[PDB]
Design a protein around this ligand. Sequence first.
Ligand SMILES: *[C@H]1[C@@H]([N+](=O)[O-])C(=O)NC(=O)N1[C@H]1C[C@H](O)[C@@H](COP(=O)(O)O)O1
Ligand SMILES: *[C@H]1[C@@H]([N+](=O)[O-])C(=O)NC(=O)N1[C@H]1C[C@H](O)[C@@H](COP(=O)(O)O)O1
Lengths: 264, 264
Amino acid sequence: MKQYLELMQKVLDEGTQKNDRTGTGTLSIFGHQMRFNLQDGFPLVTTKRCHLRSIIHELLWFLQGDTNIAYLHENNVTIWDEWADENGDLGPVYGKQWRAWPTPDGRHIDQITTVLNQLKNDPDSRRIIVSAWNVGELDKMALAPCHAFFQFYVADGKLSCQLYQRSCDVFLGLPFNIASYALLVHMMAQQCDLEVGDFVWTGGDTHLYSNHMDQTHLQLSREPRPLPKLIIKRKPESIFDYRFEDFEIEGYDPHPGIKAPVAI
Amino acid sequence: MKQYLELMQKVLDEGTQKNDRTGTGTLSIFGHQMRFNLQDGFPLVTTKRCHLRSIIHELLWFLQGDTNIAYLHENNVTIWDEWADENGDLGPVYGKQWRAWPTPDGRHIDQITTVLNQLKNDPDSRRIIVSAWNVGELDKMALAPCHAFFQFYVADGKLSCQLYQRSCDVFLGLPFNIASYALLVHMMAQQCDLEVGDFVWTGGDTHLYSNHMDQTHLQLSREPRPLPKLIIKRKPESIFDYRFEDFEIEGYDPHPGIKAPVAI
Ligand SMILES: *[C@H]1[C@@H]([N+](=O)[O-])C(=O)NC(=O)N1[C@H]1C[C@H](O)[C@@H](COP(=O)(O)O)O1
Ligand SMILES: *[C@H]1[C@@H]([N+](=O)[O-])C(=O)NC(=O)N1[C@H]1C[C@H](O)[C@@H](COP(=O)(O)O)O1
């Protein structure tokens, strides 16, 4: 995508070399914002094939509050395997905090349901927020949430969403992170009878790993294609009732897939 | 400031009218980012006088973990009066979460001290984050945090910081919110022996209240002045040991103050 390649180019031109947790080494910039009007098309990267099965199943898995990888395996998705313990557990990551953030006084808070209530009863509210950054539980997590905090916004009958992502692996993560949230926006707007508006991505430490340099130069030589169209076939009873096959991505014609090593 | 007036102009040209919690009505945009190189000068608005006493004392008050307004009153700062209960209490807002976020298992976490430890021992970490958005306690707060979540970043010997602000009152709030965080950056870099880098501001629902329209047109006719210089006179033992008079703002020559009604 246009915005995606401009970002890739910017890290190459303007990033400073940095050490990082993994030992891999990176080129990194700090702070960047991109806007996607979800009306122009579904923001799925076309300059390499992205694995939709994985993107979609992760989202469904988040919406369940499942933090164990068994559901991913039943569905042949292995993108979380490097970080699970032998029981296949990741600790109270994403979905646990979305569905059941633990309070100090014993309760559990379902932010997703909270958010549908706000969008159904108080669309102008400026507090329509989901956070994964539960400070009290970071140390139980296999990995701190990279996509940490997001806000919904309604104006003129359209649903918008902004994501704060503290740490972005531009080559491997960002293409999923974008498709994934764009999906949630479509699902949420459907549930709430809204049009889709913009998805705004905001990054903190936005980086390209040092052993993604040939892959990056390869993808930047590619010309982007027309964006696909997302079709949801059925309107489920609830945001928690989507099935993988309710989604149709039509007109998706990427350049070939490009393999790159994961930073563990 | 340049970036500040361009933002003000953008909400006027591009905002949609919105109802809001207060009943006031606003022009609102969603998602905007501005960068301030803290080396070019201290980003204190010059097109109207800003009350430094208030900006500084609020920050000091946050660093204490005080959520009661008594400390502000001892120091003649009344910017929190509209929201306190009769005992002068605001609930577990900003400073409570910065200094003593309560865990579900009984503990309290001091994110500020956590952050100095990360900056002193692991500057490349991409998890140097403070959050005020404690979901478990939002309902105890007099007001949900507007400036909710912020991240530090070190590269080339310089300290940077990005703020996610879910709700920005552009006329009244933003000029404080910016001065205030720019201050924290200077304090933190001093404590950590770093140079100041950039302060990056990221907004969600970024708005101009409808009864700030004449004030806004008035301030946009003003020409911005040279930015002041911030001088810290002493290097205290700790981030918690700053006193109001350790700070000198030199070269600050604003246009006159402009009064506007607070949205309660
Ligand atoms: C993290 C990631 N995730 O864990 O799901 C994601 O969704 N997107 C990412 O970009 N992602 C990256 C950012 C970073 O390169 C590593 C996490 O490392 P730290 O930032 O050191 O925690 O994964
Ligand atoms: C909120 C504020 N604060 O409570 O300290 C601040 O520091 N900056 C703000 O801009 N500010 C504004 C945003 C909004 O206009 C109101 C809060 O209202 P909700 O967004 O409806 O909670 O104060």
